[PDB]
């Protein structure tokens, strides 16, 4: 079986498990994305933010 | 194979026939045959048979409309009802372990129906359906008419309720009709795949109701004559018959043989019906799609015999005459011993096949059981076929060509002949 084919019969077939998947997956996704793109932005604007220049004034 | 059994037989004190082949099939098949067809409908309570037929499984004394329908379906049984112009045949089927439940529901339906005003009124418009579904076949028209043209009192009556009466049948008329015609002297209990002790035991206990024919039929005064329903179908159907003789006389057999001489039906798929005398006679002046076959009706009271024509629009005049001529030149006596010997095989085999499956068998056992006294094994029938001489056949054809005529036609009847033009 393919990944798609296993994914179908293990998680998408029963509408119960389908929903649970979306939930689990969305919790997992949320953190990954948030922290990923937070990181991309923080790099894109490296040096400039109060979290980068915090240490100096403590 | 297993070991063939005697179709047992009894006739209780009050004239009630009982019969039971125990052929150890997995299935059990039980009929209760009753003399209550169209013939016993008077000139007022018409259709009451027809409604009564549909009315199986309306609430009864011991079982509700629900319990009946769902109870049988719970074991996958079946409660059929089969009417002739003479006999009603309430017939059950099921596995041989359920026989008593199906027997039970059968007796309630026959001995103990309530016919509740609000159920019977609700059932009425089914007549409209069941009738229209059946008059799809243009034959039904023609045959219904034919009896109404031929006979008057009893057998002129249709199997399907007349128009005006649809709705008008009262629950009193059912009570009345059942009470008067569901009686021990008019009933035969037939069993296939069941032992004789239990069929008796139940018959004694729960079918012993008033055994006094509450009405009797008439003697079927044959009239004769013609009914013609002009209606523009592509084809034209028309039947022409004459007073034949009743079933149970050796004169019936001669007409049966006379039938398979003339026309029986297809025996070989897609053939040209080479042997069929009628088809072949009318095969030759007329070059078109057409059909003809030998009509042979035979009841206890009387009988019909002649032919049925499904011709073209304008070929009606030709086909009906051409076919008539062919029967005439049999009455005049052109019948080789080969032709009687072929027909005797057709019939001998045709009968033997028609009781092969349990379905036909039970209908013949119950047919004999009511029509006259006890079972007449196949050998005697096959023998009686042989018994018919080659004179009796030509005398049957002589009785037709000379006899009083009944014609029933429907189609576009512009080029259709009348009995006096024939």
């Amino acid at each position: 079986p393919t990944l798609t084919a296993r994914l179908y019969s293990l998680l998408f077939r029963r509408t119960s498990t389908f929903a649970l998947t979306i939930v689990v997956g969305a919790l997992f996704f949320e953190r990954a994305f948030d922290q990923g793109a937070d990181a991309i932005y923080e790099h894109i604007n490296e040096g400039k933010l109060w979290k980068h220049i915090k240490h100096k004034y403590e | 194979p297993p070991h063939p059994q005697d179709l047992e037989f009894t006739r209780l004190p009050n004239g009630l026939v009982i019969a039971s082949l125990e052929n150890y099939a997995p299935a059990s098949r039980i009929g209760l045959f009753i003399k209550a067809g169209s013939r016993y409908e008077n000139s007022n309570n018409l259709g009451t048979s027809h409604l009564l037929r549909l009315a199986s499984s309306l609430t009864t004394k011991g079982a509700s409309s629900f319990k009946i329908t769902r109870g049988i379906e719970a074991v996958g049984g079946k409660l059929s009802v089969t009417s002739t112009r003479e006999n009603m045949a309430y017939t059950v089927e099921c596995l041989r372990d359920d026989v008593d439940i199906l027997m039970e529901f059968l007796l309630n339906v026959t001995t103990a129906p309530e016919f509740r005003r609000w159920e019977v009124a609700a059932l009425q418009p089914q007549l409209r359906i069941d009738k229209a579904v059946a008059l799809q076949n243009p034959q039904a028209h023609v045959i219904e008419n034919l009896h109404a043209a031929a006979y008057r009192n009893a057998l002129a009556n249709s199997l399907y309720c007349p128009d005006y009466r649809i709705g008008k049948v009262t629950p009193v008329e059912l009570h009345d009709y059942v009470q008067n015609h569901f009686t021990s002297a008019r009933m035969a209990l037939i069993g296939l795949g069941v032992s004789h002790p239990v069929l008796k035991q139940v018959a004694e206990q729960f079918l012993n109701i008033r055994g006094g024919l509450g009405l009797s039929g008439a003697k079927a005064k044959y009239h004769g004559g013609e009914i013609r329903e002009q209606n523009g179908d592509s084809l034209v159907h028309a039947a022409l018959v004459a007073e034949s003789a009743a079933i149970g006389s050796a004169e019936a057999n001669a007409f049966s043989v006379l039938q398979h001489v003339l026309g029986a039906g297809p025996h070989v798929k897609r053939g040209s019906n080479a042997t069929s005398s009628l088809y072949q006679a009318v095969a030759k002046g007329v070059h078109q799609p057409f059909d003809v076959s030998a009509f042979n009706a035979s009841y206890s009271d009387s009988g019909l015999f002649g032919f049925y024509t499904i011709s073209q629009a304008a070929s009606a005049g030709d086909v009906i005459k051409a076919a008539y001529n062919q029967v005439k030149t049999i009455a005049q006596g052109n019948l080789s011993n080969p032709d009687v010997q072929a027909a005797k095989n057709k019939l001998k085999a045709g009968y033997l096949m028609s009781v092969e499956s349990s379905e036909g068998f039970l209908d013949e056992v119950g047919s004999q059981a009511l029509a006259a006294g006890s079972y007449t094994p196949p050998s005697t029938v096959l023998q009686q076929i042989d018994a018919v001489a080659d004179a009796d056949v030509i005398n049957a054809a002589k009785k037709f060509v000379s006899g009083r005529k009944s014609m029933a036609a429907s189609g576009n009847l512009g080029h259709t002949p009348f009995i006096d033009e024939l």
């Binding site: 994305f33 948030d34 793109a37 937070d38 991309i40 932005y41 894109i44 604007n45 040096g47 400039k48 933010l49 109060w50 220049i53 004034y57 403590e58 | -």
Partner: protein, 240 residues
Amino acid sequence: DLELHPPSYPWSHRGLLSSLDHTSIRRGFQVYKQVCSSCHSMDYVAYRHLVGVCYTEDEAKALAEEVEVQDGPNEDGEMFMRPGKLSDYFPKPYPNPEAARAANNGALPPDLSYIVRARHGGEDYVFSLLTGYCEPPTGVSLREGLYFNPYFPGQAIGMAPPIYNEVLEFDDGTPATMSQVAKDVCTFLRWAAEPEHDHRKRMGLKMLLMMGLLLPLVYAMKRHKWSVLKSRKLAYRPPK
């Protein structure tokens, strides 16, 4: 009736994902507190606002207690001054427009809270104004109290050129040039007028990536559904 439009000075925060430079905000703040807090009100900012932006809580509170602000009324029903605290909004140069004008030859120095968004060009203008002062060309005289600035409209501003080299000295010890001051105070004024600015642009990134992800996925579903109709085949078969 002629007007000179600003140029496009490229700030560290110009590009669509580029954040403000909090060090330069920090410096800019001092430029306000030292150079302009004596004529320009910044009515909608308070010391707490600075915390976590360009100052610590302690630094900010120390910045607060640096000022005497009025409070009251007390038990006797009388108003009294007290040292500032985090929740105090930057103190006001005057009591009212009439006072502010009467002190400056009739002209009222506008509030700087929203000045960056209240003017076309924004910091590219304010910068250009602050540094762009120059001499009246042959033909142009001016009233007393008016100075010629070509970036201002009507070229006759009532603001004395407010920054020259080393008008103050910064905490971190950057070269306190004129153009290096204007840059920092403009970077600050931007934050003053738009505190959301860094966060907004970060959300913007998340929105872009998210639409990135969804907008094809949905289009896909739409297409999956409509396939049935887009693919179909018709056939007219009349008889005779």
